[model samples]
Target chain A: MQIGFIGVGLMGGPLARNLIRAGKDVTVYDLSPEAVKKTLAAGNTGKAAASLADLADKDIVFTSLPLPTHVLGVVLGNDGLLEKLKPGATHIELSTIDPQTSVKLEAAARAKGCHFLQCTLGKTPAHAEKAEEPLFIGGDKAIFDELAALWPIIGSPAYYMGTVEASCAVKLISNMVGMTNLAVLAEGIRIGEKAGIKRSQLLTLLQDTGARSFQMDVRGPWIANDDFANRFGLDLALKDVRLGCEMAEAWGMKIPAMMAALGIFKKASATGLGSEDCNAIYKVTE
Target chain B: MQIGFIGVGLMGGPLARNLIRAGKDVTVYDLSPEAVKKTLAAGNTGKAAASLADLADKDIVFTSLPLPTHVLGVVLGNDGLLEKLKPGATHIELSTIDPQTSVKLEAAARAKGCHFLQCTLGKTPAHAEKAEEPLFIGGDKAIFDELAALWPIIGSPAYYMGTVEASCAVKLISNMVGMTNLAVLAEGIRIGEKAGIKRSQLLTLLQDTGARSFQMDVRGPWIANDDFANRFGLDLALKDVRLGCEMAEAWGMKIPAMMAALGIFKKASATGLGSEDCNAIYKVTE
Candidate 1:
């Protein structure tokens, strides 16, 4: 099968290489000429420079893109893949997006007789580089099982959720849970510091309590040193929570904790923390 | 040396028993007639339901009761322990309270030539029964050292947190962190359920991500099953956060994340969920 992978950004760069290393006939695209060449060097794109038009004839297209807007524009917009792809071709979206957007995109794909699946990643760039992330996939059983074997190339453990909407929701909610907790921990550890309790003391106390979490594993040390170097972009943290809040709005439910966390991150971005790391979230609480 | 334990309640009953088992001449007091008998059943209090004055003569006084108000009323209130406690007495507070209150009580003790140590617990009543909770001890160095052997009877790992304020602050921050994350998880998991993703699926997915934490270890199952039986009272959850926020107030800081969580938990309490388990903090968000 001919494969075209889009969005060779921080995450996609590694995933595209993994697809090729597993010996797939994969062509890759990125808005960045540098990154396009970076991924193109690893595989046979059969073309000089990356173009969406050239990828039209490929049997499959996979997008590990940023933002719902980017995916919708590239896959369903003017001159996009849905209009150009042959009947029975497959398109899979592996971005963290809202459930409503995923469903809307899938419906559009069905109208074009192109199969669609959404498998939002359960990890970050480092896991993508290792191909050890978990994928929460959602779609029709027939379309999902056919692409099942290809999943392990991206995720060590891939889950087949019931629908495209669910895949996105689960991933988004998990991110919402984690990101909110990170901000909450930022407030918590800061209060500990303010109370004249050492961060080192808190790290030890939390280890044996219910407050112990991977977020703390990540938040405590960077916090102890007052470092906010963005291993994960603060901009994306706001984006993902906004997506989750948008999803909540459609359902008529209130996410008080998430919305509160969203406000803090929004404050972080408004103060120019967006250009830096997620650890800077601690500063807004400060 | 005589050991007088005021408030032989849920936590104190077990702790008073451990004192007798470890061979201390421990006398326990509680306003509840039955509760006093429960502690009396363990060892010696000699007199039945000893008045507050009777406890004034003991060399050491330990209170594992509820509320800062309660601790102050019994220890520093008019005709309370301070007015009657002899010189060289050591008064230890085990209940969770605001640092300012702890410092004030310690000051009152110092004026009377009595020593004070504030040790807030890091584990629940179950751990107390096993004599294996962690105690965050804060006060004068000498008093904490003087009671070093007794701390092991309460905590498997007792931390000397340099000051009573640091100890209480550390304990409150730890609780605030866990309680806030618990409510935050309630929001995330509820939204996941609303999005048609099974709590079971999320349980598996969250385990592998940075989102994973001890909150999930405790929150996922109770949430998946919709059980809110009060193993840990939602009322106490509010009390602990209130104490933490009070400390934050004294420092002239805003704890947005903690405050947001405090709001949710406060909402839970006002919605009549406070008497039930901590898990019902999910309900208000729902």
Candidate 2:
């Protein structure tokens, strides 16, 4: 199969490499010429297509860009993939984009006799870098099954969310949960210190407690002692939460606790820890 | 030495029994006739003290009553212990009273030559039942030293917080953290669900994430499964957070997260789930 990969950032880079490792004929395009060259150097048929039009013959096109704009930009921009892809070819969106936008794009792709799938990954940068992330796909089941083996080559635990928007929602919700987990983890350690519990003791107790979640397990020890390495920056987390908060407001739902937590992240960003890991929110302590 | 224990409820009842089990000359009193009877049944002396004056001749007086008024009234009311007790007897106040009230009572007792000590226990009903709560004592150091063995009987891990107000401040701050934790736990879990993560994945991921706290550890599984059995009630939790918010306002501090969590708790209470465990706030699900 011919696979064209675009946008080699945190999640996209390793995934594209995984495609090549699995023996697919993979071509790549990235705004960064160096990144495209790097992918080609990694021993696969990686072609630096001038634009999406240059890669239209590929059977499948995949993009792992972040946020709604870049995802839409590369899809609908002049010489963009949606306009340039061959009829009947599949477009898998791995970006965490707006749900409504996903639906609109899905309609646009179908109108052109192309398949549209949102393959949102349950991934951390750490996991994405190793191609160890879990994958969720939403679209036609027949199309999903055809691509099933390919997903395992790039990630694991492929969940079929049944619709394009559902997959996007999963990505948004999973990251929101992760961000919420970070907020509470920092708050807990602050109080634990005041109560005379050692940081290690508190961390151990938490791991053993009902609070043990994927995000907590990753950063528990680090935040308990104030380690703020930004595999995921505070600003990114704040942006993720802000996305959910705006959605809640649009739904006329009240997310009082999340709003408050987002406010804290906003202040954390204002303090110039926007570039630091969300765990730096513990600095709100004093 | 004679040990007089008044108001033998859940806490004093167990403490006075342990004193008798240790073979101390312990006399107990309470407004509830059955409490005195239970104290006697537990191998302790029962005194249906006609009034606070009946404790006058006891070598050491311990009042483990509830509320600020109960602590103050039994000491300062006409026929109260302060007026009736001989000059120079030691009085121990172990109730969770307001710090200002404790200080005022300390002054009144000292004027009458009675050594008044404010030594409150930071206990849940569970902790008190297990006799493993932490104790925070204020007032004089020498008097606290004299009551060393007695402190262990009701609470362990005691700290002398310099002044009565400081001890109360510590307790208040600790309560604020705990209460904020409970509200945020539910709110965080709800947001994760809305964002598309299953309860199972979100909670487990939260365990692994930066948001792990005692509230998460202790209440995570229970709340995730909707099993709120009153470990901490929504109403009382709301009250504590409300109190903390007011205290923060009084201090001229910006506690956005704490206040936001407080609003959530208040909404939960307004929905009439006030008696449910605070973790049940997740049931709001909006």
Candidate 3:
């Protein structure tokens, strides 16, 4: 497989490197040579794509841009990958974008006789490096089955979501649930502490009961220890939640809990902890 | 052991029956004779308490009322257990109340020369019947250990929380986190459905990823199937979260996520779903 990968930053860099290690003819693109060189060092057959033209003949082109606008910018209109790639080639997106953006990308791909797929990443960059990140994909089953063989080289099992739109939507929904859970977990521990139970005891006991959640098992310890590094930056979390709120508005739906969690991330960001780990929303509690 | 169990309602009734089945000398109390008779049928060593005097000679007394005021009313005044129970007897409270009330109850017990403990219930009435419910108890370790053996007859392993106040506080905190997680899970499945992903797929996919929580594994299916029975009543959930918010305000702490979840439960309750399952908060999203 000939693969052209764009936005080789934290998460993107490792994914492209894994593909290179698998002996695929890989070309990686990024603004920084520092980031691009890391993926190039993964194998002798990899090249650095200096321009969109370098990906013109690739069989598979993947973009892991930071936001929906950036993803759209990289794959649409002039100087974009949609018309540049071969007619039967595929274009895959790995960013967490809105379903509408996924639809636009799919339409643009169809206009150019190309296939579009979305596979949003789950977990942190650390999971990416271990090839343990989850994949939620959307596209035709035939295309998914062909690509499924290489998915494990870069991530865990894949979910073949029915459409490009559903893939992006589920990712936001997943994050919406997780971020709200984390925000409340911070409250639980803080109140438990202020009310006299030690943080360690509360965290330990929670795991053995119905109060247990992924947030408790993952971010609970970080909040207890005050470790708020950018494992998953609060700024990024706010942006996604803000987008989720927008998505709800577009559908004329009300999500009280999701919107409330958005306010919490905003409050924590207002405290200048935007770039800290999303768990830093715990900082908003006390 | 001679035991007196007041408030033999759903949760309390099952718990008292479990203890009676264990051959403890139990006397059950409730305004409803029907509720009290269920416990009387548990074994041959149980009786229906006629008045406060019946519990005065008991070695241990337990109260599992519905509210902090009810718990206080049952144990704080002249005809209450604090004054009625003999000296050297232990009074274990099984209600989820504010830490302040626990402190008040402890003070009332201290003045009456009686021991006080808080043992909050986890899971549901079904778990209580099976003796599988988890316990969070707070009091002196010596007192906790001495009563710990009979505890398994009503619930699972126990956490000897440092004080009666901490036990109540932690239970409120635990419910606060679980409720917020459930509220967000409702939003998640709702938005995912509106965005085109099936609830079954989203719930299934979430379980295998960091988005998984106790709410998803336990309540996700119920929401998908539209089963809003009173397994855990919304009114009860709202009460606990409201108590948690009050506790936070008392400490001058900010818990935006928890307060937001409280709003979600309140909205659902306003729609007349308070007596339904707490997962009925999903109704608010739509």
Candidate 4:
């Protein structure tokens, strides 16, 4: 199968490589020459396509952009993939976009006579490096089944999150829960810091409690050591939190925890730690 | 040295025994005769005092009540201890209460020419049973330093959170975090249930995030199994969250997350799940 990958970046680069390593004939593209080079270095066949039009013969195409605008600009822009890729080819979206946007984009792909799938890969660098991450695939069950082999290669055990927009909700829910943990953990650490409790003492009990969340486990040790160094900076995590909040609002649900966390994340971001790891939130709390 | 223990229950019973095992002369009291009997059975001395007047004779007195009201009922009521405890003797309170209350009670004890210390213990029954719970104590350093030997018997170390009220704040903060996690976990589990996710699958991920507070890890499994059986019933957790929320509100802080959780917890209580273990909170979310 001819698999084409685009927007090679943090999550996308490793994912595309995994597909290539699994013996798929992968063609890759990225606006960043460095990102494109990384994809090639990982043994994926690099295709510096002169725009999206060069992929007219691809069997399947995957785009892993970071935001809705990027997903749209690359997929349906004036000379974008929607107008360029082979009709009837499948295109998988791995961006964290609004659910409505996912539905709209799916319709756009259908209008172009192609199959559209929304599958987000939640793979941290650690997971990408070790090859064990979660993948949520959405769309027709038949298409998900056909792409089963590529799913495990990209993520350990993929889940069919449901039709089109469902994957968006699933990913948003996970991200919301993860970010909530991060903010609350930061708050607890801050309280401990102010009270003169040893960082070692706080870290020990934090892991032993219900407050332990996926994000806390990932960033707790680093923050405990005062390492504000950027692993997954505050901006990306905050962006996801805000976007998830917008979606939750659209669904008429209130997530006060996420809101509280966002205020702190925003404060941290405003104070120049935005570029620091989301765990850098503790710096402000402390 | 003579040691007096009051309010024998799930947590306090074991704590008193630890003090006894450490070879202290431990005397105990509680409204429940069975509780005093259990303390005596644990190889400790049991003393059914005539009232606070008799308790005053002891060199050191410890009271482990349930809520702030219970603590206050024992200390400020017409027959309370402040009027009867001996001058210069230390009264250690182990119940979780508000900082303001702690301050008021401490002042009351000082007014009687008696020394009062707050020695709040933090742990589950399982932890208390294992003698690994962390204790947080506060008050005059001189008084606490004098009784430092008793703290390690209950746990490995005791954090001097600060003066009288600060120890209460630490306990409140700990419970606030635990309640927050339960509220979120309940809602998350409910969402998963509505989406037709199996109970096993929901709990597996919940527990896998060992980063979860011990409350969530232990409660998630109980709720997932459809056993709303109360270990630490919903009512007490609700009371603490309410206290925590009120405290935050009085401080002029917006605590939508806590308020939101309280709303859900209240709904669960209203549904007659108040006596059920907090794991029963999952039913509210679903």
Instruction: Write candidate 4's Cα lDDT for A117-168 as tens digits.
Output: 9987665756865468767678878889887767767776687777666677
Deviation of model 3 at A152, angstroms? 5.2
**Across residues B1-286, which tens digit of lDDT does each residue of candidate 3 receive?**
6899888887888889988888889898888989887778988988998886788889999998888888878777777777777798999889888888888888888887888888998877888899888888887777888875787788877767878878887777778888888887887898888978888888988887667899899999998898998888889889888987887888898776677788888888888888998999888776
lDDT of 3 by residue, A27-94 (tens): 98898888998879988988998788888999998888888899888788697777677898998888
Residues A1-286, candidate 1, lDDT per residue (tens digit)? 7888888788777778888777888877777887877776766632222478878888888888888898888988877878989899988888888887888899998998999998887677888888987778899889888887888887768788887888988888877888888888888777887877777777877878878888888777887788878788999989988889889978998777788888989999999889777778888787
- Taking the tens digit of each residue's C-alpha lDDT, what string does model 2 give over A1-286? 7888878776787788777666778888888888777666766566677877777788898987867788788887667778878898998988877677788778888998899898877657577656777777888888999876777788767777777756776566555555655665566556545445556655664453334555566777787656888778788788877876775666566767667777778878888889888788878843
Interface RMSD of each: 1.3, 5.2, 1.6, 3.7
In model 3, the fraction of reference contacts reproduced equals: 0.81
Enumerate residue pairs that collide in model 3: none
Ten residues in sequence with the least summed lDDT for candidate 4 chain B: B205-214
Superior by DockQ: candidate 1 or candidate 3: 1
Interface RMSD, candidate 3?
Answer: 1.6
lDDT for residue A282 in candidate 3, whole number 0-100? 77
Measured by lDDT, the strongest candidate is: 3
Model 3 chain B worst lDDT window (10 residues): B76-85
Compared with the true structure, all predictions reach lDDT values of: 0.82, 0.71, 0.84, 0.72
TM-score of each: 0.96, 0.81, 0.91, 0.86
Q: Report how far off residue A108 is in candidate 1 (Å).
A: 1.1
Error of 2 at A176 (Å): 3.8
